[PDB]
Amino acid sequence: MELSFGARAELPRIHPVASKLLRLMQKKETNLCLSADVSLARELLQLADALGPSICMLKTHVDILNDFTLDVMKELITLAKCHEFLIFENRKFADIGNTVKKQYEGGIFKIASWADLVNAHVVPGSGVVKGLQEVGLPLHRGCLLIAEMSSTGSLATGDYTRAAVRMAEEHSEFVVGFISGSRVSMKPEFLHLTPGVQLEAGGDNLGQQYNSPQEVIGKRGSDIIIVGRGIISAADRLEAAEMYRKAAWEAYLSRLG
Amino acid sequence: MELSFGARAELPRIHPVASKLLRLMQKKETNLCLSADVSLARELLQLADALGPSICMLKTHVDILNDFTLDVMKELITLAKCHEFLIFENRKFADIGNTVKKQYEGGIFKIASWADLVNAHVVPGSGVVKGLQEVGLPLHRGCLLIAEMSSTGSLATGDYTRAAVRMAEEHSEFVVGFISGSRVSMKPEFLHLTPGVQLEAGGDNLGQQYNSPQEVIGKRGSDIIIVGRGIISAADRLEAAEMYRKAAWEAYLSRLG
Numbered sequence: 443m444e445l446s447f448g449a450r451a452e453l454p455r456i457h458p459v460a461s462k463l464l465r466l467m468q469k470k471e472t473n474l475c476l477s478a479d480v481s482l483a484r485e486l487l488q489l490a491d492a493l494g495p496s497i498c499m500l501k502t503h504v505d506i507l508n509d510f511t512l513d514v515m516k517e518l519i520t521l522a523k524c525h526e527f528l529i530f531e532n533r534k535f536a537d538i539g540n541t542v543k544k545q546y547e548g549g550i551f552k553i554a555s556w557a558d559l560v561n562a563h564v565v566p567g568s569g570v571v572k573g574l575q576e577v578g579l580p581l582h583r584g585c586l587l588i589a590e591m592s593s594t595g596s597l598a599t600g601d602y603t604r605a606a607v608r609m610a611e612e613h614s615e616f617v618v619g620f621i622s623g624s625r626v627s628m629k630p631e632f633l634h635l636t637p638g639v640q641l642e643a644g645g646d647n648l649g650q651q652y653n654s655p656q657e658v659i660g661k662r663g664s665d666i667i668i669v670g671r672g673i674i675s676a677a678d679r680l681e682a683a684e685m686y687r688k689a690a691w692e693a694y695l696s697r698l699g
Numbered sequence: 700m701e702l703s704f705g706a707r708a709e710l711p712r713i714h715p716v717a718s719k720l721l722r723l724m725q726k727k728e729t730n731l732c733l734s735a736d737v738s739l740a741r742e743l744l745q746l747a748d749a750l751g752p753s754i755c756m757l758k759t760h761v762d763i764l765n766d767f768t769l770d771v772m773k774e775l776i777t778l779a780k781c782h783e784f785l786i787f788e789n790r791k792f793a794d795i796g797n798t799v800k801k802q803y804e805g806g807i808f809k810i811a812s813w814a815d816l817v818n819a820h821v822v823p824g825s826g827v828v829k830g831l832q833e834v835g836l837p838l839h840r841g842c843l844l845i846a847e848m849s850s851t852g853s854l855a856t857g858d859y860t861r862a863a864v865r866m867a868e869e870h871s872e873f874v875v876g877f878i879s880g881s882r883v884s885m886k887p888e889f890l891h892l893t894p895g896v897q898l899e900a901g902g903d904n905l906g907q908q909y910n911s912p913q914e915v916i917g918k919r920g921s922d923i924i925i926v927g928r929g930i931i932s933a934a935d936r937l938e939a940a941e942m943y944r945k946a947a948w949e950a951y952l953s954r955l956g
């Protein structure tokens with residue numbers, strides 16, 4: 443039946459990036475992804491260093507960093523290697539393949555040079571994956587497909603979600619999992635990462651909706667929680683991260699039995 | 700029945716950005732949007748200057764510019780004002796409102812400071828529009844919603860397309876039209892902009908599919924053609940732009956009768 447993260451890391455069809463992730467999740471007893479939604483490089487780096495031991499992944503929006511430089515990403519990579527977490531740039535590539543390939547490799551951000559993982563919306567059809575793959579496969583990177591969204595009015599439901607799952611399963615050499623609210627693939631080689639997570643019930647004023655780690659990992663069968671404001675707006679971000687880590691980890695263990 | 704671009708510019712419910720666009724389209728006899736998919740600021744600017752008289756709009760992907768600076772955008776604005784065209788950043792905002800508001804205003808690109816128009820995918824629900832509006836309305840900007848896509852396997856069909864149209868029509872203070880393959884709204888106050896356009900039949904190797912200006916403007920009832928490689932890969936980009944302009948303009952006139 444259900445396998446531990448450590449065993450999933452060894453599955454025949456596992457992607458190397460997924461394997462690296464699954465192994466460090468097991469080693470560190472963390473299935474928490476920090477959503478580092480900050481505008482200052484110094485804050486990003488100080489969070490990455492202090493919280494690194496508590497997280498399996500740090501999710502970036504590099505396009506909201508007021509003082510982005512590639513040197514900032516070099517320093518982030520140093521922390522990622524030191525503390526053992528992956529870097530996930532939440533770029534949401536969402537256009538024709540020819541365009542996304544350039545967006546992934548080029549420009550000022552050079553996302554493919556530092557990001558272990560990126561994500562894509564599936565709305566354009568499988569060309570979005572094919573374009574990204576042309577850059578990501580040579581660079582030994584992975585991709586997540588957005589199969590469901592956390593926000594009110596999300597159209598990523600029903601046949602749309604099914605299409606995302608098929609697209610992932612048909613591009614397993616590059617696609618390693620999903621942004622989703624629940625387990626959407628029955629194949630254990632794929633990771634499920636779930637945003638819209640806080641300990642307390644609520645939402646924001648712009649359509650975000652929250653569920654708890656126990657709900658999303660335990661009841662809905664996801665693997666990793668993505669948490670932004672629940673941690674970032676807290677006074678003690680380290681303690682907050684530990685609370686989220688312990689919640690997500692125990693929900694995982696209990697579901698494993 | 701059908702109104703000229705000039706008359707549409709005066710409609711009671713017209714958005715000011717739409718009005719400005721419609722008036723310059725009529726004045727200049729152009730419903731061509733150049734997709735300036737280049738990596739060099741100098742090429743971007745030289746295209747903008749030479750082709751400015753032939754276009755109603757210049758569409759950017761600032762994240763593929765290797766030498767982006769805000770000064771480049773200042774120079775682009777100077778050309779836009781001189782030649783009378785709008786600047787459209789094809790950012791495809793596609794996340795929860797709280798995130799997109801920061802992506803629109805902030806970061807290195809400060810998109811809202813220079814872009815007349817941006818676009819958004821509707822997959823997250825109407826929060827994507829609400830978040831963007833919080834920045835764009837004060838700055839007197841407009842937004843386009845992606846109702847259909849040109850690429851093979853597009854999921855922007857059926858109820859998804861209907862949802863995009865409703866979302867636009869319910870946020871008319873900020874949303875001024877669509878990226879689509881055809882007329883999708885029956886309300887003349889909304890613009891339809893159509894990518895996937897070349898004179899010759901064909902596609903690319905990454906899921907792009909082409910139709911002609913006569914097909915998309917004439918038969919499918921769209922307003923503006925978005926053209927990248929058909930112009931940019933041509934030797935004489937000025938002549939190419941003129942060919943596309945004259946095609947799209949005559950298709951418009953004939954449909955007007």
Ligand SMILES: O=c1cc(CO)n([C@@H]2O[C@H](COP(=O)(O)O)[C@@H](O)[C@H]2O)c(=O)[nH]1
Pocket residue numbers: 477479532590591592593621637638639650668669670671672794795798
């Ligand atoms: O459906 C989604 C998809 C994404 C992409 O990961 N996100 C992102 O997770 C994070 C949630 O942050 P929060 O915990 O502060 O709401 C944000 O960066 C948001 O853009 C969501 O919140 N919901």
Ligand SMILES: O=c1cc(CO)n([C@@H]2O[C@H](COP(=O)(O)O)[C@@H](O)[C@H]2O)c(=O)[nH]1
Pocket residue numbers: 537538541734736789847848849850878894895896907925926927928929
């Ligand atoms: O459905 C879409 C949506 C977009 C967003 O505008 N686009 C964009 O139009 C342009 C088409 O370029 P081409 O004429 O070279 O194919 C590209 O920048 C591509 O990213 C499309 O090609 N199709």
